[PDB]
Design a protein around this ligand. Structure first.
Ligand SMILES: O=C(Sc1nnc(/C=C/c2ccccc2)o1)c1ccc([N+](=O)[O-])s1
Ligand SMILES: [Mn+2]
Ligand SMILES: [Mn+2]
Ligand SMILES: [Zn+2]
Ligand SMILES: [Zn+2]
Ligand SMILES: [Zn+2]
Length: 149
C-alpha cells in the first residue's frame, strides 16, 4: 500500500492491471521444483529450484510476480495455502495474539516486503484445472520434468 503501509488486499481484480497466472510444482522424492508465471500481456518466466516443497514453489511464484510487476498487480494462484498464509499475515498485521507461521517464514516475509512496496494487489485462488487458459499454461511450464501432467 501507498507509503510502506498495511493496506488490505483488493476485494476484486484491478481493472486495467496486468494479470500474472502464477504456479509452482515440486517433486517430493527429489525436492526439485519450478516456479513461474505467464501474463495476459504475454510475459512469462520460469525458474528452477532445489531443496523445495510444493508450498514453497507456490510462494516463490507469487514472489516472482510481485518482483516483476508494476504498482498494481492481479495475481491468480491455485494454492489456497499461499493465498491464506499471505492474507492472514496482512489481516493480522502487527497485533499481539497473532503468532508467526512455523514454516516458510523467510519466504513469506520476502513476499510481505514486496507487497508493502505495491499500491494495489489482488490475489485470487482458482482450483487447478484443464483448458487452454492462464493457470493451465503456467501449470505446464513448471510441471515439465517435475511431475506428470
Ligand atoms: O502445486 C500444486 S500441488 C500443490 N502445491 N501446493 C499445493 C497446495 C496448497 C494448498 C493449500 C490448501 C488447499 C490446496 C492446496 O498444492 C499444483 C497442482 C496443480 C497445479 N496447477 O494446475 O497448477 S499446481
Ligand atoms: Mn499450483
Ligand atoms: Mn500446477
Ligand atoms: Zn540441494
Ligand atoms: Zn495505481
Ligand atoms: Zn528482502
Amino acid at each position: 500500500g501507498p507509503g510502506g503501509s498495511m493496506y488490505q488486499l483488493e476485494k476484486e481484480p484491478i481493472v486495467g492491471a496486468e494479470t500474472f497466472y502464477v504456479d509452482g510444482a515440486a517433486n517430493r522424492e527429489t525436492k526439485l521444483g519450478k516456479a513461474g508465471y505467464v501474463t495476459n500481456r504475454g510475459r512469462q518466466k520460469v525458474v528452477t529450484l532445489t531443496d523445495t516443497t510444493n508450498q514453497k514453489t507456490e510462494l516463490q511464484a507469487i514472489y516472482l510476480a510481485l518482483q516483476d510487476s508494476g504498482l498494481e498487480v492481479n495475481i491468480v494462484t491455485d494454492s489456497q495455502y499461499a493465498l491464506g498464509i499471505i492474507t492472514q499475515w496482512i489481516h493480522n498485521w502487527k497485533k499481539r495474539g497473532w503468532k508467526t507461521p512455523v514454516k516458510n517464514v523467510d519466504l513469506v516475509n520476502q513476499i510481505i516486503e514486496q507487497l508493502i512496496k505495491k499500491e494495489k494487489v489482488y490475489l485470487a485462488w482458482v482450483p487447478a484445472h484443464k483448458g487452454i487458459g492462464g493457470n493451465e499454461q503456467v501449470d505446464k511450464l513448471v510441471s515439465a520434468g517435475i511431475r506428470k501432467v
